[PDB]
Symmetry: D2
Subunit: 312 residues, 4 copies
């Protein structure tokens, strides 16, 4: 008895649609009984809330019909979707994301072996209860910490603060880590009855930064604003003033950082208590968006949003 693995596709094929895959990568038949569905068909750069909501509901609904899920996803925004699923999926069976940095028609296309390794990962018993995983370049990465570090490299996906969970060699995984932050079925976040998510945008800080992007969001009634701060989540003066005001009138404000590794730490550079801001910790801006969006479905209180940022 081979496990049953479902492949959910969100866009194009990564090994050169969706039931051609066993013909494209025959070696899959030796490790799993694979079924494919095309859930949506969208470029990863146009990824949106509604695809997220659809994916989390499909997985939650089909959890009992299958032994594990592999999701094919483009690489641009993989890190955002993976973290969203890591917080909202209530199946504790393996959920594994995979993509390809080189097109399937290129010489030395990475997608076939990536796909193989993702199925291997989803079929391994040891992969359960680790949260949502990304499998790229022979490495098993957790959905919270994983990000893309290079624009074109096949090795781009890394867990830049806390490292990978395991490495795969000839079909076996050497797991030496598991994430400590709460995920999947240990979260309070439940999207089964939601058709939309709170509105959260992102503004960038840099020298002589304009406050107009932040104003535009505030005027549109955004529920939350994440700042991609400079250094340890600092803000250009004018952006600071716009966001301090917005926080007093009830917009949730999260300080993150444009710096690619390390925590934006609480009350270090900025008195968060006083302005009602939240510090993102190791969550980069786009990940901090995901968590703020979910937090805002439970509460609008900054001090409770801070506690959520400290636990998930």
């Amino acid at each position: 008895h081979l496990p049953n693995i479902t492949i959910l596709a969100t866009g194009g094929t990564i090994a050169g649609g969706v039931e051609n895959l066993v013909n494209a990568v025959p070696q899959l038949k030796d490790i799993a009984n694979v079924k494919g569905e095309q859930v949506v068909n969208i470029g990863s750069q146009d990824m949106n809330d509604n695809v997220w909501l659809t994916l989390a509901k499909k997985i939650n609904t089909d959890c009992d019909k299958t032994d594990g899920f592999v999701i094919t996803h483009g690489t641009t925004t993989m890190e955002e979707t993976a973290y969203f699923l890591d917080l909202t999926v209530k199946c504790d069976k393996p959920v594994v994301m995979v993509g390809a940095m080189r097109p399937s028609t290129s010489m030395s296309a990475d997608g076939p072996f990536n796909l193989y390794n993702a199925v291997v990962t989803a079929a391994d018993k040891a992969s359960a209860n680790r949260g949502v995983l990304v499998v790229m370049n022979d490495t098993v990465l957790d959905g919270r910490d994983v990000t893309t570090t290079n624009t074109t490299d096949v090795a781009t996906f890394k867990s830049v603060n806390y490292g990978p969970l395991g490495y795969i060699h000839n079909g076996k995984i050497d797991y030496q880590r598991t994430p400590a932050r709460k995920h999947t079925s240990d979260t309070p976040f439940d999207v089964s009855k939601l058709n939309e998510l709170p509105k959260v945008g992102i503004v960038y800080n840099y020298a002589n930064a304009s406050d107009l992007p932040a104003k535009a969001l505030v005027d549109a009634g955004y529920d939350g604003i994440v700042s991609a701060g400079v250094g340890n989540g600092n803000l250009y003066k004018s952006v600071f003033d716009t966001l301090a005001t917005a926080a007093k009138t009830g917009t949730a404000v999260v300080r993150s950082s444009r710096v690619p590794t390390g925590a934006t730490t609480q009350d270090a550079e900025v008195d968060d208590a006083k302005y009602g801001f939240v510090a993102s910790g190791t969550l980069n801006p786009q990940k901090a968006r995901v968590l703020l969006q979910l937090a805002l479905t439970q509460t609008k209180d900054p001090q409770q949003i801070q506690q959520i940022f400290n636990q998930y």
Copy 2:
């Protein structure tokens, strides 16, 4: 005869203002005759165009009165100022930027040894003709490639695409590289008669991104917009449409990437020729701003702006 080195301060002191430094770091007297001036006094997170213009003019004006310059600068935006100076400074004597990741009153403050090493660097003949340098954690980094990689680490400054120029051990530098792109006195950019710079902002791309930040900038008549794209400088649909429109009406649009290393490459993901967009290459968003600002003082033509992005 020791060289004469001028220290230009832009904010607080990094070794625990500005003529206390020889009392704070006595070992400086053995390597140089140091003079200090406080040029401005601003936190690095509030760095702006007018401080840039002031610094470039002071250096250009005092070039003949001194043997090299060390500029003390906070770390948040060091990478932006360093690149601006690298394009606008016409002195080919050493210009060395330095800062500290830990406050001067902390245990194991990094600023004293950083300062020492920066003076060593500015005093060494071998440092001339390398463009503007950043000296942090015993390493000599070029102003184009240097960026901050971690929020709090003392080792945060790295040249993430092409590497450092030299390493410093016991007061000697082992230089094995020099930057190939044109800098300082080989650029056409001259700011001696400018009192302001063209207006360039930055917008971030992410899943379900709002086009309101980009619209706000367009409506304000910004000269240029830099996109912090996803992957190889891709854009969320709605942001794409707003920027394509703005490009046809004459706003300069530069595609960069929120991904921390690697080039945003020309005509790969997006038909730049067709929409009149420019690809940033290895320039991250905040560096791409600096170069676009300068480019816009010579030309508004996208194809000529592309050539500038390929040469500096």
Copy 3:
């Protein structure tokens, strides 16, 4: 009340006698009641089996007299001593190692703040049951994965395969990981009655490698040989012949790699089952020696040695 922390020194001071550490770093008083003892006084380059046996016995014996230990240790061999203790210490209270890349009298000496952070770590209840820890440059690292990456950098100590356990900001640790391999009280190794350890040596592979080093060890009767192989543990032919013969006549032979990251994997390059060799996995040559010495106190059978390499 504050915890009681014992500092065991093995060498010279890393801040400022071991009983005056509280005078060098008076801030140690606010976080713990500190007692120091000098266990030995040697340079870390001269570290040896007799120091290791002393250290482990001392910790095992005094485990109940204290809330946690901090060991000051030279950087050259920290990574070897830390993995030895990680396998032999039967105390589940925090054991934390710490050193300094810069001499204590130098400008921007790193030791004081490293010492402080080590005591913070040893005092935190959360630090217990994680194995023996190395704290350097604001980072908590497990003793199995930690290694030195750079000859001189203060940020040298990294866990290159699996990452750090936590980061320290303002006296608080954000732990997001714990090691999965068995350590401390869960190992079978007990050194309380040992006065010496099996003789294990290391040979290097390279182009045109001499077999004389390997022969010299075999003729001297060494119990075990660790090969620092090329690539994925591969061996130059002369070295391979010598070691094949040694393994057939009773020497334990472990294939590791000179390459600084990744696993030397089992039956990939070399037929381990045929020759009776053992693959080190992610243990580098110096750490593979440590585990091989200990394995040899329990068994001389290669299959069982391999399993020990797969669990510890």
Copy 4:
């Protein structure tokens, strides 16, 4: 017209006989007229002085018959062969080395695209006068700094101290660096009349290190010994005693480090002037051997060896 590129093979094929490479990768035809020759056929683990001498003579002799060379070579010792040729080849036409981390029959085999990119590099006029190059994973690396960082990763090859020379995107190279140390036609080393090279061996340091390996080399009459030291080239006491004595009685002794990045610096840990030792700087043990072998063809004097280590 297209350039003529010669591919010299040293082993098995990395894509798909060496005369059929144009059938394995037919896209090679659009960028060059390719000729292949099999110079030897061995595993890179078995690389030896006689192959090196053959390769360099062959390149020196055929320099005028071709526009550039590509050498296919196993990954285990690439970094040694590349630095040897970088010092001995007197052709200033492009010499490019290339291999594959995955077997040519495996899924997502890296060789074909690496081969293609190697030919692109050898054909680019800009690639000339940069020394011997390694092209792997879309990156052009100089033969002096390049090393393998990971046992299995396709992205393993990095220039860990000073960075890559350029990146390849869509058949175009963006070169931003060139090596400063002297190479190729600017070196004094000439192997055209040599049939053998001086005997240079490597010993490893670690806790409780045996001196037997070092004694075995000295008793066999080795011309030179490279110490893979701990930290900044430091030595275990027994190893230090043996090597001190060897150096006094005519053996050349170079201190390198087992630590994978940074310089082993001159008179810091060890008094080199007193013992007659030479510090390797940034050359790792296997590369220090290469330079030491060649230095010994010109001099046996330590001060002059040190200067050679400071220029090449």
